[PDB]
Structure formats: C-alpha cells, structure tokens
Amino acid sequence: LGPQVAEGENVFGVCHIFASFNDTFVHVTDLSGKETICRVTGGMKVKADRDESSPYAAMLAAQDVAQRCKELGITALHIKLRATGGNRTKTPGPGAQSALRALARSGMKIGRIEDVTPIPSDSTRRKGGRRGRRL
C-alpha cells in the first residue's frame, strides 16, 4: 500500500502548517498539493476551546498525522508555514514550533522550510474601527 521505492530514496510530501491564535492545522499533501494524505486539527485532540492553539494539541496532531502518513509510505516532508495573514497578524501562532518539533520527533525527514503567509500589496479595511479593540 504505497509507492515502490528503494530504501535509499525518500518519498516526499508537502506539510502545510496553519498556526493561528485559535487553532492549529497540520495538513499533508503530495508535491502538487492537490491530493490529501491526512489532515488533523488541534481541535480534534483537546475537548476544550482554550487548548486548540496550545502547543500540546499541536504536538498530538503532529504525531497523529506523522503516523498516518508513515503508514502510506511518505518519509520526508516539505514545510510550508502559514499564518492567518490578510489584514490580521503575520506572526505564526504558538503551535507551529511545537508541531514542527513533534513532526521531527516521529522520525520524519524534513525538506525545505518556506513561509507562505499571504501578504497583500494593500487590502480592504480591517475590522475594529478607528479606536481599535478596547477589550
């Protein structure tokens, strides 16, 4: 169940890590990004709205997806780190680094890292108004 590849060569996939401040996504696709191998979100691990973006949930999701993709026959992953982007923050959430470290722990080989956060040249008006969020 998988590619017929010699032991020396590595089968490559692309891992899209979407680290928000509310949730974390670890998605695995082929090199064209059109076929999904496994997608696990931080909300599937923890049964609470607080810990969806926590490093622990990201670590659990990374191990889950690593085992699932190791079953099918993918040994190496390219990394596309993504933030929410747009009008909102460009800084990745707290789960990206933990998810990547956990994915390294599971024996997966790491390809090239690339930032893919969408950056407008200029965009629509941001939510909040003139005075901003007053909390």
Binding site: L1, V5, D30, S32, L72
Partner: protein, 213 residues
Amino acid sequence: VVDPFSKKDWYDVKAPAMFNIRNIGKTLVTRTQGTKIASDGLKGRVFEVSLADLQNDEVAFRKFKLITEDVQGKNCLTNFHGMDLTRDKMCSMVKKWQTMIEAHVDVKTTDGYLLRLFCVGFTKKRNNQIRKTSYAQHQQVRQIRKKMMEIMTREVQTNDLKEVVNKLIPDSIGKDIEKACQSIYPLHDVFVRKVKMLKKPKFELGKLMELHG
C-alpha cells in the same frame, strides 16, 4: 467504512530535458471507475520545485513551477509553467536606506508562448561613501526601468521557450541589466524575480516529445 486509499495509484513525474535531474518525485491519483478518467484528473497539476533540486550546482532561492501536460503510462510529463523567488530572499533584499526599481513586460516567444516578466533592482552604496542613503533621482529611476524593459524584451521575443528557460536558469538577464545600468546608477541584487504564463499555443504532442527527448 471503506478505505479511500486502497483505490489510489502512484505515478512518477518527470522534468523536461532542460534540467539535469529528471525525477522530481511522485504523485497520487484515484483509479478509473469508468466515470472519471485518471488521466484527466492527473493533468493540470502544478509542482513548485527548487532549482537546487533540478540542478546540482545552482542556487536554491529560485523556484520553478512545472505543469503536467501528458501522461505516458505511469510517467507524467511536465512543462515550464512559471518561475519565482522564495519569500525570505525577497524580504532580505529590501532594505531601508536605498531605492528599489521594479519593471514588468509582456513578451511573446517565437513559438507562441506569451510571458510576463518582472524585474527588481536596488541601488548600491559606494565603497568609500560617507552618506547614509543611496537614492536615485526620478529620471535616473525611469532610465533604469526603461533599460530593464528593453533588455527583458530583446531576450525573449527573439528566442523560444527552450532558450528562455536556459537563460533563466543562471539568470543571465539580471546580470545583463545590472551591467548595462552601471553608468546611470550602480545597482546590486538585480534579478528577474517572477515569470508568469499568459497564453499557451495549441497542445502538440510532437513538441512535448522534442521537449523531453
């Protein structure tokens, strides 16, 4: 209930003869059940491959988009579809106390491929310069942009796509632009940063087979 990956099959995708390394990885596709042909879903896929994965001694911050055009029995055959630079290279090229000049052209090759080329350059500080900033006046910027546009135009419409990719691999166009613009204002970090495909000719199998050997 029923495993969706038991009906999947693996294909091997090849790069055109222009690059040294041909095997650029594998891909997955559902088998044909008579309703959907696997070949139809297989075509039209885009792969972003770093140049260091296509040529051994070339830089790694230049990526190429290759699009599958034909399937030959567990062998997807791709063609040139685009070129771009990595995010961190562009983010590190832009600095605060200098001028940036950008240009774009639309040029048609001899074989019908229409391309949109983008070029970027930055003003270079002198070796013994004491002034903090290195700013070019507006007329100098216009002259530099026109020099970029003419050089990019004269290196595409004369050649065809196969020669265009050959010039793009080491990016000789950027070196030509940088050398030609020395007299106006010194420039460093001159590159052709993005290339877009606008119009393709009618698909020809013989052209693809010549492109792959």
